[PDB]
Every structure is written in structure tokens, then in C-alpha cells.
Design a protein around this ligand. Structure first.
Ligand SMILES: N=C(N)NCCCCC(=O)NCCN1C[C@H](NC(=O)C(=O)Nc2ccc(Cl)cc2)CCC12CCCCC2
Ligand SMILES: *[C@@H]1O[C@H](CO)[C@@H](O)[C@H](O)[C@H]1NC(C)=O
Ligand SMILES: *[C@@H]1O[C@H](CO)[C@@H](O)[C@H](O)[C@H]1NC(C)=O
Ligand SMILES: *[C@@H]1O[C@H](CO)[C@@H](O)[C@H](O)[C@H]1NC(C)=O
Ligand SMILES: *[C@@H]1O[C@H](CO)[C@@H](O)[C@H](O)[C@H]1NC(C)=O
Ligand SMILES: *[C@@H]1O[C@H](CO)[C@@H](O)[C@H](O)[C@H]1NC(C)=O
Ligand SMILES: *[C@@H]1O[C@H](CO)[C@@H](O)[C@H](O)[C@H]1NC(C)=O
Ligand SMILES: *[C@@H]1O[C@H](CO)[C@@H](O)[C@H](O)[C@H]1NC(C)=O
Ligand SMILES: *[C@@H]1O[C@H](CO)[C@@H](O)[C@H](O)[C@H]1NC(C)=O
Ligand SMILES: *[C@@H]1O[C@H](CO)[C@@H](O)[C@H](O)[C@H]1NC(C)=O
Ligand SMILES: *[C@@H]1O[C@H](CO)[C@@H](O)[C@H](O)[C@H]1NC(C)=O
Length: 336
């Protein structure tokens, strides 16, 4: 035993083939180390420890990882004049491990909303395979809750704090652009989507005191925040998630396949801050991705403590809460 809450400089590990150039590998061979050959996680009997993912520093430290991954690897056309070669792109799991004198604690309490104490703690040396997808409004290719749906928020009462809806059922998404080049779409199972979405509203009313929950498309911003931007094979997609957030469809004559209009923007505003950048025309041929929806990035706006309704509009932008959704059950303690 003996430990104390502390921080340090972490290190990473990954199953990264040294021949492939799917950039996540090419970067995880020269910055990460091989995966733990034989790894054990030791449970701690009759012990309880408090966690909180919003003041946690593993998240920050991982953000400083993906930033260098994207500034090093993928390069733009545009005083900045470069060559913009088409590259390969496919994320891979990356484990996060403590050096010497420290260890990682893991909360496997079946539910657990993130901030607070555990009860079923365990001590690991590395995290686990965590895919660094950089996406907004919808969390894709993450992990899933092993019990029920959970809403994660710092201050649930606050009105500019982002919300996170960890799902217990992965909703398949399928986005394509075959053979204007950059005119794409995304097919989603409306049946699966709205079954799970009914569930999502039930939980939101469980936290918000049997109040009428309503989903609304974004107020107004740049397409980065108001339009589901993800990265597909080195292509930056933009999907008008307006048919996803409709409270009418919660019988009814809407439950089939929800095609969604998308576009492959060349001019994007970075998520690392400071400026914009332009890339290059799409690769000829079918460009598509098949990802799992697993989390949900909402920002209910305030001004309805009195009315019997609360409006929730999709959000995101600060990719930090993309990581929080995954390193919520981990804390780095030092062997004091
Ligand atoms: N200083 C300002 N300009 N403030 C006004 C904006 C406040 C709104 C805000 O603070 N929102 C959170 C942080 N923001 C996130 C934005 N995210 C993206 O553009 C993005 O994720 N694109 C993307 C997504 C997926 C892929 Cl695959 C590829 C690209 C940009 C940066 C910003 C930080 C603070 C300044 C601007 C807003
Ligand atoms: C604690 O978590 C582990 C791993 O998730 C699982 O076996 C079970 O939920 C709990 N086990 C014990 C012995 O409490
Ligand atoms: C999370 O659980 C704690 C109890 O440990 C509670 O005080 C807090 O309000 C909960 N927050 C949410 C968003 O469920
Ligand atoms: C997800 O959680 C909800 C809680 O309301 C539950 O009703 C549902 O059966 C769960 N689904 C799965 C697949 O665990
Ligand atoms: C935010 O919500 C929590 C939940 O109980 C509350 O305890 C905390 O004090 C709130 N903070 C403020 C400043 O209201
Ligand atoms: C999507 O989820 C299913 C189970 O819900 C899982 O078997 C599959 O591997 C996931 N796909 C990806 C790309 O992670
Ligand atoms: C994805 O959609 C394309 C065309 O819409 C289709 O050819 C492909 O089989 C689909 N894949 C999945 C897993 O739904
Ligand atoms: C949607 O999911 C259901 C499972 O409830 C399945 O039976 C149906 O074929 C799926 N439809 C589409 C278009 O994905
Ligand atoms: C909501 O109302 C139902 C009955 O309509 C009740 O069983 C439940 O306790 C209520 N919950 C909240 C959070 O108001
Ligand atoms: C999304 O499509 C709707 C119509 O379905 C339109 O009113 C809205 O302006 C579109 N959003 C963007 C960002 O173009
Ligand atoms: C999710 O994972 C699948 C399979 O690993 C991959 O094809 C897809 O591109 C991924 N999605 C994103 C947004 O990276």
C-alpha cells in the first residue's frame, strides 16, 4: 500500500507496426514503447478512494500528446507554404503508464459518474487501449458503459459546462463518398438511434427532476461546433446532425435509415487553436468510414429553471472532454 494523490510526467505504449505508415503507428514507434507483454492489475481489498475527471491531469497530459501527433503528422498546404501529400490515417489504441515511484488507480465500480469516490478500486501500471479520435458532437470509437447510461458533468447545474452521455449501446454510423467530389453522406440506423435516444431522455429527466427534456440543433457558431466534424481517412467531414436531434420522433412513421448530408471541407479551423488551415482535394474513389457512436457532447443553455422544459443542443470543440470520457476511471497516485 501507501500512496498519495500526485502528478508526474507519464509515458505511453502501443501495438504499433514499424512497417506501416498509418501515421498513428509511424508516430507510436518513435514516441511510444511496446505494449506490456504480461500485464497484471491488482485489486485492493476493502479500500475506497476519491476520483474526479475534471481536475485530473492525465487528460491534460494526453491532450499534449494528440496535439503533437497532429502537428507532426498530417500537414497542410497553407506565410506558410508547404507540400500537402495525401497520407494514410487510422487511429490505434495507446496505453498510458506511470514511471517509477507512481502507479495508476482504476475505478471499476459498475456505474460511477466520474466525480466522487469509488469502492472497487484496482491498481494498474498502464491504462488501456484508448483510441485518439478527434471528433465533435458525437464521440466515436470509444469504450462503452458496462451497466446503464450515465450523464457526466462537472457542475450539472451550470449552463456552460459540457455534458457527456456515456452510452451502454454502440450505435453504428456509416459515412461514405463514392464516385462535386466532396459531396458525402452518413447513413445511421434510425431505429437503433431513437431507441437509444428515448433512453437518453429518460436519464436526463432522472437528473433534472421529471422535467420535459427537449433536444434542439445548435444555436449558432462555426461549422466545427455546429456540424459533426470527424476525420475519415485523412478527409474532414461535416455532417448536418439535424435529423439526429428531433424530439418529434420520440406509433410514429419515422424509423428506418437516417441519411445525413455531409461535405468534405478543405478549409478547417484547427482544434489546437491559433488559425485555420487548408488541405487538398479528396482521393479519387470511395472514401468511407464505419464508426461506433458511444458518447454524446451536449451543452444545455440556461434560462429555464422556471419553465417546465430544458433544451439540450449538441456541442464540443474543446477536444479535452473527448479524452475525459475515457480516462475518467483512472488516477495517477504516487507511492508516498
Ligand atoms: N477565442 C475564441 N475564438 N473564442 C470564441 C470560441 C469559443 C467557443 C469554444 O471555446 N469552443 C471550444 C474550443 N474551441 C474549439 C474549436 N474546435 C474546432 O474547430 C474543431 O474541433 N475542428 C475539428 C474537429 C474535428 C476534426 Cl476531425 C477536425 C477539425 C476551435 C478552438 C476553440 C478554442 C478556443 C478558440 C476557438 C474555439
Ligand atoms: C470489481 O470490478 C471487477 C472488474 O471490473 C469485477 O470483477 C467486479 O465488478 C468487481 N469485483 C469484485 C471482487 O469486487
Ligand atoms: C455524481 O455522484 C456524486 C456522488 O458521489 C453526486 O454528489 C453528484 O451530484 C453526481 N453528479 C452527477 C452529474 O450525476
Ligand atoms: C442501458 O441502460 C438502460 C437504463 O435506463 C437500460 O434500460 C437498458 O436496458 C440498457 N441497455 C443495455 C444494452 O445494457
Ligand atoms: C455544483 O453542483 C454540485 C452538485 O451538488 C454542488 O454541490 C456544487 O456546490 C455546485 N457548485 C456551485 C458553485 O453551485
Ligand atoms: C463497435 O461496437 C461493437 C460492439 O458494440 C464492437 O464489437 C466493435 O469492435 C466496435 N467497432 C469498433 C471499430 O470499435
Ligand atoms: C456503409 O454504406 C455503404 C454505402 O452506403 C455500403 O456499401 C456499406 O456496405 C455500408 N457498411 C455498413 C457496415 O453499413
Ligand atoms: C437497425 O437495427 C435493428 C435492430 O433493432 C435491425 O433489425 C435493423 O435491420 C437495422 N436497420 C438498419 C437500416 O440498420
Ligand atoms: C418522476 O415521476 C415518476 C412517476 O411519474 C416517479 O416514479 C419518479 O420518482 C419521479 N422522478 C423524478 C426525478 O421526479
Ligand atoms: C442543416 O439542414 C437544415 C435543414 O434540414 C438547415 O435548416 C440548416 O441550416 C443546416 N445547417 C447548416 C449548418 O447548414
Ligand atoms: C473507427 O474504427 C474503424 C475500424 O477501426 C475505422 O475504420 C474508422 O475509420 C474509425 N472511425 C474514425 C472516426 O476514426
Amino acid at each position: 500500500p501507501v500512496w498519495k494523490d500526485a502528478d508526474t510526467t507519464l509515458f505511453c505504449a502501443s501495438d504499433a507496426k514499424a512497417y506501416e505508415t498509418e501515421v498513428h503507428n509511424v508516430w507510436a514507434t518513435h514516441a511510444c514503447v511496446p505494449t506490456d507483454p504480461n500485464p497484471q492489475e491488482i485489486h485492493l481489498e476493502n479500500v475506497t478512494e476519491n476520483f474526479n475527471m475534471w481536475k485530473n491531469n492525465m487528460v491534460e497530459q494526453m491532450h499534449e500528446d494528440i496535439i503533437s501527433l497532429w502537428d507532426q503528422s498530417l500537414q497542410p498546404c497553407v506565410v506558410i507554404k508547404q507540400a500537402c501529400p495525401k497520407i494514410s490515417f487510422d487511429p490505434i489504441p495507446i496505453h498510458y503508464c506511470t514511471p517509477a515511484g507512481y502507479v495508476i488507480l482504476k475505478c471499476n465500480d459498475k456505474n460511477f459518474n466520474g466525480t466522487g469516490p469509488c469502492k472497487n478500486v484496482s491498481s494498474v501500471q498502464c491504462t488501456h487501449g484508448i483510441k485518439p479520435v478527434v471528433s465533435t458532437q458525437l464521440l466515436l470509437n470509444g469504450s462503452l458503459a458496462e451497466e446503464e447510461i450515465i450523464i457526466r458533468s462537472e457542475n450539472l447545474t451550470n449552463n456552460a459546462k459540457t455534458i457527456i452521455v456515456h452510452l451502454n449501446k454502440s450505435v453504428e454510423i456509416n459515412c461514405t463518398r463514392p464516385s462535386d467530389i466532396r459531396k458525402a453522406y452518413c447513413e445511421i440506423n434510425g431505429t437503433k438511434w431513437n431507441k437509444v435516444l428515448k433512453q437518453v431522455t429518460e436519464k436526463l429527466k432522472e437528473h433534472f427532476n421529471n422535467k420535459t427534456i427537449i433536444f434542439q440543433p445548435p444555436s449558432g457558431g462555426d461549422l466545427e461546433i455546429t456540424m459533426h466534424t470527424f476525420n475519415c481517412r485523412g478527409e474532414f467531414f461535416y455532417c448536418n446532425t439535424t435529423q439526429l436531434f428531433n424530439n418529434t420522433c420520440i406509433m410514429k412513421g419515422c424509423n428506418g435509415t437516417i441519411t445525413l448530408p455531409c461535405k468534405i471541407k478543405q478549409i478547417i479551423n484547427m482544434w489546437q487553436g491559433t488559425g485555420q488551415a487548408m488541405y487538398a482535394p479528396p482521393i479519387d474513389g470511395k472514401i468511407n468510414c464505419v464508426s461506433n457512436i458511444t458518447g454524446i457532447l451536449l451543452t444545455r443553455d440556461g434560462g429555464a429553471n422556471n419553465t417546465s422544459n430544458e433544451t439540450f443542443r449538441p456541442g464540443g470543440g474543446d477536444m479535452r472532454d473527448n479524452w475525459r470520457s475515457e480516462l475518467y476511471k483512472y488516477k495517477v497516485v504516487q507511492i508516498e
